[PDB]
Amino acid sequence: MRPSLSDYQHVASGKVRELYRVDDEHLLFVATDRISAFDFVLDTPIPDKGRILTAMSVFFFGLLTVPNHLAGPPDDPRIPEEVLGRALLVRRLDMLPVECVARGYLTGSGLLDYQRTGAVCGHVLPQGLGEASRLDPPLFTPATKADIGEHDMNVDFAAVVGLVGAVRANQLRDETIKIYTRAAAHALHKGIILADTKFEFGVDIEGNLVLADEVFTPDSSRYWDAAHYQPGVVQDSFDKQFVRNWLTGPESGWDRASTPPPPLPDEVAVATRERYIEAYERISGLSFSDWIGP
Ligand SMILES: N#Cc1c(N)ncnc1-c1cnn(Cc2cccc(F)c2)c1
């Protein structure tokens, strides 16, 4: 007899996730089956996507030695049946207002900042880099949230200091790079490049830094197939390239430059689910058929 989701108070919504209050010290972190492409939440859900990404996140939390916000098992009785397998019970933290990003490779807004200025978030880089260039060491490229529907804004280290304090800023930088390095090496051993990743942290009652997000999902991180890694061109999205190709192809009737995109073919949604499962099983060495559900 699990509680109903309606027993809990909705406190936040993101593009493809939701957050509920369970009691004064706990929340329910819910992944949905919604998928985003080209900054649009698409009309068509991906079956099992919320469960697969939750499974991925749980695997990576277990791999990392840093404190995290998980407060119970994936089958915790406080989790409603409706969201079983795609929701986790978590401890309430005081969240730090920094999107902590690590980049092991140069792409997206990092590449654009470099092409415009020669630097990214305060880091002056070597000349001659380009799309999907490897960065060593990985860069800490923090960002801040903007208005609803707007992209996060890249900021430099001084901005992080101004937001959270000098010592805490150093801690965020160091932990973000350490965590990314560990996860990226694990994934690469399994044939997947984690090109970059985005974390949020919070602080507990005792002042301790706690990892408090989904971690190393394909929504929070760029997944690439290592076997096809080719510096100098845009890498395929391991999980979303079918979706991107169909939307921008001749069958969609949609022009990306002009705006809400049409629904996806059922076949594209099913193929996409397969890509998520493939990524999960390769990285975790586990079978998704063993992951809990309703
Ligand atoms: N995680 C976490 C968390 C925590 N453990 N304690 C306090 N606050 C948060 C918290 C508040 N906003 N978010 C972002 C977010 C996440 C998931 C779904 C959403 F809609 C929005 C995270």
Curated annotation (Swiss-Prot):
CDD domains, A to Z: SAICAR_synt_Sc
Pfam families given in the database record: SAICAR_synt
InterPro entries, per the entry: SAICAR_synt/ADE2_N (IPR028923), SAICAR_synth (IPR001636), SAICAR_synthetase_CS (IPR018236)
Alphabetical GO biological process terms: 'de novo' IMP biosynthetic process
EC number: 6.3.2.6
Principal EC category: ligase
Record-annotated membrane-spanning stretches: none
Record key words, sorted: ATP-binding, Ligase, Nucleotide-binding, Purine biosynthesis
Involved pathway(s): Purine metabolism; IMP biosynthesis via de novo pathway; 5-amino-1-(5-phospho-D-ribosyl)imidazole-4-carboxamide from 5-amino-1-(5-phospho-D-ribosyl)imidazole-4-carboxylate: step 1/2
GO cellular component terms, A-Z: cytoplasm
Catalytic activity of the protein: 5-amino-1-(5-phospho-D-ribosyl)imidazole-4-carboxylate + L-aspartate + ATP = (2S)-2-[5-amino-1-(5-phospho-beta-D-ribosyl)imidazole-4-carboxamido]succinate + ADP + phosphate + 2 H(+)
Listed GO MF terms: ATP binding; phosphoribosylaminoimidazolesuccinocarboxamide synthase activity
Keyword ATP-binding: yes
NCBIfam families linked: PRK13961.1, purC
Family: Belongs to the SAICAR synthetase family.
Protein name as catalogued: Phosphoribosylaminoimidazole-succinocarboxamide synthase
